[PDB]
Amino acid sequence: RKLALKTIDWVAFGEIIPRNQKAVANSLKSWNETLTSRLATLPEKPPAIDWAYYKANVAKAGLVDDFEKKFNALKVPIPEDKYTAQVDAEEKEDVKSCAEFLTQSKTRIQEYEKELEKMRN
Amino acid sequence: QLEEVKQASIKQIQDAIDMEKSQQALVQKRHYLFDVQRNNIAMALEVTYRERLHRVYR
């Protein structure tokens, strides 16, 4: 498993953030840099066990059979969420970055650009 | 006479430039934070499943 599917560019996230979090982005960038590099290394999982070999060749062949029906049944989970509240914070921070600031910016850039049509006089 | 007309033309474009860029900037990075963040998250959930298979097999 590689980087989580969503990829935003490393300079477009990494220059710009709300004023409330301004210094925390440049740290969180480096924290996500070490995590994305640290996770990109790993073969996700080992091989299986050759069982008929292990049962023949460990001459304690009945200790072996416990560990078959145990290991063949005993399956590992992937770790869970605890911080996808960053996606709700991202929808709220897009309502802020887009809609709230976008429409407010479109009336303020127009406040100047309508004064630039007045400056044509 | 000449000063004020050129002065206004400068000062207006000064405030115009930053604000269309300020618009774009807030959107793009912040959308660009989101999917960034969630990389970093999902990165680890597979490792741990991944790594686990090796660890338990050992």
UniProtKB/Swiss-Prot annotation, chain A:
GO terms for molecular function: proton-transporting ATP synthase activity, rotational mechanism. Transmembrane segments: none annotated. The modification N6-acetyllysine is found at K29, K45, K60, K69, K75, K82, K92, K114. It is found in: Mitochondrion; Mitochondrion inner membrane. One of its GO terms (biological process) is proton motive force-driven ATP synthesis. GO terms for cellular component: mitochondrial inner membrane; mitochondrion; proton-transporting ATP synthase complex. The keyword rRNA-binding does not apply. The keyword Iron-sulfur does not apply. Belongs to the ATPase d subunit family. Subunit d, of the mitochondrial membrane ATP synthase complex (F(1)F(0) ATP synthase or Complex V) that produces ATP from ADP in the presence of a proton gradient across the membrane which is generated by electron transport complexes of the respiratory chain. ATP synthase complex consist of a soluble F(1) head domain - the catalytic core - and a membrane F(1) domain - the membrane proton channel. These two domains are linked by a central stalk rotating inside the F(1) region and a stationary peripheral stalk. Component of the ATP synthase complex composed at least of ATP5F1A/subunit alpha, ATP5F1B/subunit beta, ATP5MC1/subunit c (homooctomer), MT-ATP6/subunit a, MT-ATP8/subunit 8, ATP5ME/subunit e, ATP5MF/subunit f, ATP5MG/subunit g, ATP5MK/subunit k, ATP5MJ/subunit j, ATP5F1C/subunit gamma, ATP5F1D/subunit delta, ATP5F1E/subunit epsilon, ATP5PF/subunit F6, ATP5PB/subunit b, ATP5PD/subunit d, ATP5PO/subunit OSCP. This is ATP synthase peripheral stalk subunit d, mitochondrial.
Curated annotation (Swiss-Prot), chain B:
Subunit b, of the mitochondrial membrane ATP synthase complex (F(1)F(0) ATP synthase or Complex V) that produces ATP from ADP in the presence of a proton gradient across the membrane which is generated by electron transport complexes of the respiratory chain. ATP synthase complex consist of a soluble F(1) head domain - the catalytic core - and a membrane F(1) domain - the membrane proton channel. These two domains are linked by a central stalk rotating inside the F(1) region and a stationary peripheral stalk. This is ATP synthase peripheral stalk subunit b, mitochondrial. Belongs to the eukaryotic ATPase B chain family. It is found in: Mitochondrion; Mitochondrion inner membrane. It comes from the Eukaryota. The modification N6-acetyllysine is found at K6, K21, K29. It comes from Bos taurus. Component of the ATP synthase complex composed at least of ATP5F1A/subunit alpha, ATP5F1B/subunit beta, ATP5MC1/subunit c (homooctomer), MT-ATP6/subunit a, MT-ATP8/subunit 8, ATP5ME/subunit e, ATP5MF/subunit f, ATP5MG/subunit g, ATP5MK/subunit k, ATP5MJ/subunit j, ATP5F1C/subunit gamma, ATP5F1D/subunit delta, ATP5F1E/subunit epsilon, ATP5PF/subunit F6, ATP5PB/subunit b, ATP5PD/subunit d, ATP5PO/subunit OSCP. Coiled coil: none annotated. Transmembrane segments: none annotated.
